[PDB]
């Protein structure tokens, strides 16, 4: 099972918009401590669970619903529904376990899914990136993997881990 | 809406049956009725639909032997059976949908299904 | 991982006394509706969770006090803290999702255990046995086993599933 | 009851260390003080113990090398280290123990341990 979804194709507000929202996210849970934009989570899935098919079927729907013509500026609204709606898999996914890593935490995760995403564990990610003052590039992946450990074990099964960098 | 089943039975491979599905109430015109069927141990398949206007749609396992047709008067739909084979042994249900657009499809009712029994 | 316990060496009330810990197990969790005896339960179980692995720790570890020299009165106590203890990983599964199904399943399961165990998913089952009127023999079995589907997909993982034949 | 590890260091392979552990409080009779090391990414494994009346116990791996003895009266406990080998490196990590029964161990007590590095 893989399903990855790269869209290049943002405005710079329908980028700031989804960041915004990633941010009530980060603010929604336990908080933890002991150039380019990158923004969103890295969760990691049990696809043997009920949960974790239930899951696979609401993300499938979205990147599904995402493939549609016109489909760009929904995109926000849409994203507003999958991961806020906790009478949905992944809406409760988010809402329960999710924790805020520092950011020399999150640098290695994130390099290495951008090693693993360039060429067993169920991975699950939604990840928006600026490369900039002006803008030069803005962009949503946004995917379900199977991989090696991105996690230092620091993570468990629908825990879900938050990026953040700047 | 009700949706009642009828005309299943037993038959030798190679018969025919008439599938028989009535709706207790009138069918919007956006509505599509389709015949499911669902093999001992198996998930319900399609196996044929039919819309308002008698655009038909058939599944490949079936195409060529059976033949769906809809009386919008009676708020019916048939299914002709012909050339039956044993692999066609199934609870055979119909249904009520309709397409909200190309993407969606929204299932209202279902029938209580009726049993049809090909022997060898 | 295997882990597999017999004892034929019980007595009547200690039979009798497990019996009681098990129906109070039966009464405590939803009941559901659509010679000799067999009292206990299997519960499927996911190794790669905390939860699957931290029962094991207090399984394996009941097994290897079982393993005792004198250690025969004691199985009455030290099974109602076991299954009756929700501060732990197996008295707290127990608790969650444990359903009582009706004999009609029950033989099934049961009789499928009794072959798999005889010659990928973890089961676990604790299961007492009377054969008489008289007592011609009392037996507990009880282990950990990885094999072929006993629960018909009418189970899901920790759920726990009430034997009761008579 | 806090215990203090010292003498760890860097030294070379073949070479010698003596670590030191020394409690703030009595240690009870039936209190085992052991030695634990620490790999870097590694768990932390059993080196060696001694009870209260000297008997002592060694892991395999530094059997014939280590020497384990206690001082009762300071309430401190020693590992002389001989014949040292680059898998030596490690964080050492004192603590006190008793047995409850023949499979019973409760831990009461670490140190914070300290650093051993052996050169090649």
């Known amino acids: 099972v893989n399903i990855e979804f790269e869209a290049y194709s943002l405005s710079d507000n329908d980028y700031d918009g989804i960041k915004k929202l990633l941010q009530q996210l980060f603010l929604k849970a336990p908080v933890n401590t002991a150039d380019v934009e990158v923004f969103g989570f890295i969760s990691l899935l049990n696809l043997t669970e009920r949960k974790g098919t239930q899951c696979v079927e609401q993300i499938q729907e979205l990147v599904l619903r995402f493939c549609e013509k016109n489909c760009e500026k929904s995109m926000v609204e849409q994203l507003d529904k999958f991961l806020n709606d906790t009478t949905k898999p992944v809406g409760l996914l988010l809402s329960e376990r999710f924790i805020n890593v520092p950011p020399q935490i999150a640098l290695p995760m994130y390099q290495q899914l951008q090693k693993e995403l360039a060429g067993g564990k169920c991975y699950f990610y939604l990840l928006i990136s600026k490369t900039f003052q002006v803008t030069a590039l803005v962009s949503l992946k946004a995917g379900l993997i199977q991989s090696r450990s991105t996690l230092s074990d620091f993570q468990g099964t629908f825990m879900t881990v938050g990026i953040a960098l700047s | 809406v009700q949706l009642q089943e009828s005309g299943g039975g037993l038959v030798q491979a190679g018969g025919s049956l008439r599938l028989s599905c009535a709706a207790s109430?009138?069918?919007?015109?956006?509505?599509?009725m389709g015949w499911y069927r669902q093999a001992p141990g198996k998930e319900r398949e399609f196996v044929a639909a039919?819309?308002?206007?008698?655009?038909?749609y058939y599944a490949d396992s079936v195409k060529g032997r059976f033949t769906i047709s809809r009386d919008n008067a009676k708020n019916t739909v048939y299914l002709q059976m012909n050339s039956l084979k044993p692999e066609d042994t199934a609870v055979y249900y119909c249904?009520?949908?309709?397409?909200?657009?190309?993407?969606?499809?929204?299932?209202?009712?279902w029938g209580q299904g009726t049993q049809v029994t090909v022997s060898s | 991982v295997n882990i597999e316990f017999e004892a034929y060496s019980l007595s009547d009330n200690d039979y009798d006394g497990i019996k009681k810990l098990l129906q109070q197990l039966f009464l405590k969790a939803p009941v559901n509706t659509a010679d000799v005896e067999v009292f206990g339960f299997i519960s499927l179980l996911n190794l790669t969770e905390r939860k699957g692995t931290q029962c094991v720790e207090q399984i394996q570890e009941l097994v290897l006090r079982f393993c005792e020299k004198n250690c025969e009165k004691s199985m009455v106590e030290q099974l109602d803290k076991f299954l009756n203890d929700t501060t732990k990983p197996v008295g707290l599964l127990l608790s969650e999702r444990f359903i009582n199904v009706p004999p009609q399943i029950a033989l099934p399961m049961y009789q499928q255990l009794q072959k798999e165990l005889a010659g990928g998913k973890c089961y676990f089952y604790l299961l007492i046995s009377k054969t008489f009127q008289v007592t011609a023999l009392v037996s507990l079995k009880a282990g950990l086993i990885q094999s072929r589907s006993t629960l018909s997909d009418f189970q899901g993982t920790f759920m726990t599933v009430g034997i009761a034949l008579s | 009851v806090q215990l203090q590890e010292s003498g760890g260091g860097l030294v070379q392979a073949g070479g010698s260390l003596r670590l030191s552990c020394?409690?703030?409080?009595?240690?009870?009779?039936?209190?085992?003080?052991?030695?634990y090391r620490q790999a870097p990414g590694k768990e932390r494994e059993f080196?060696?113990?001694?009870?209260?009346?000297?008997?002592?116990?060694?892991?395999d791996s530094v059997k014939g090398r280590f020497t384990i003895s206690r001082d009762n009266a300071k309430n401190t406990v020693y590992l002389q280290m001989n014949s040292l080998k680059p898998e030596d490196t490690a964080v050492?990590?004192?603590?006190?123990?008793?047995?409850?029964?023949?499979?019973?161990?409760?831990?009461?007590?670490?140190?914070?341990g300290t650093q051993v590095t052996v050169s090649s």
């Open positions: 249904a009520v949908y309709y397409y909200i657009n190309s993407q969606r499809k929204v299932l209202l009712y």
């Open positions: 109430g009138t069918i919007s015109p956006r509505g599509v």
């Open positions: 039919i819309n308002y206007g008698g655009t038909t």
